[PDB]
Design a protein around this ligand. Structure first.
Ligand code: FE
Ligand code: FE
Length: 157
């Protein structure tokens, strides 16, 4: 699809970049070290807040408009359980007070992150492969242009 009407690719390039960055940070992190431990969680909190902002932009600028056009039932824009990821990081930041707890938390963190990435990648792909075509259907080219302009502006603060 022409870039000027593609509402998912550019934002997703950033989202995928972020995924790579936290996977690298995660694998390099020494969960036995308190400072290393809190820095990763801080980074993760920021990263997933950006994810949360990304999903919100889509809900407010794309999904809502699209749904008020067709009304003829769903795909829904899935949650990805971002609030639950953010809640996890918070517990690690407020509740973990020693190395035993850091290492027990780590196993759960890795589990949950892997599962998240496992839900996030198909999620983005579905937007690109299913929602985008739908947009071309229910909106004119210029209407879609206008939507993308707002979407990209929101991602560029
Ligand atoms: Fe999304
Ligand atoms: Fe997306």
């Amino acid at each position: 699809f022409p870039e000027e009407v593609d509402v998912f690719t550019a934002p997703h390039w950033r989202m995928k970049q972020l995924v790579g960055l936290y996977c690298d940070k995660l694998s390099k992190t020494n969960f036995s070290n308190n400072n290393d431990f809190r820095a990763l969680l801080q980074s993760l909190y920021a990263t997933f807040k950006e994810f949360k902002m990304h999903e919100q932009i889509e809900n407010e600028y794309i999904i809502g408009l699209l749904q008020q056009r067709s009304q003829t039932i769903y795909n829904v824009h899935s949650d990805n359980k971002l609030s639950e990821m953010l809640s996890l990081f918070e517990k690690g930041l407020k509740n973990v007070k020693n190395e035993y707890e850091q290492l027990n938390y780590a196993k759960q963190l890795k589990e949950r992150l892997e599962a998240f990435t496992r839900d996030f990648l198909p999620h983005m792909k579905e937007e690109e492969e299913v929602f985008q075509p739908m947009l071309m259907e229910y909106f004119t080219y210029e209407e879609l242009k206008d939507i993308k302009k707002k979407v990209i502006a929101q991602h560029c603060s």
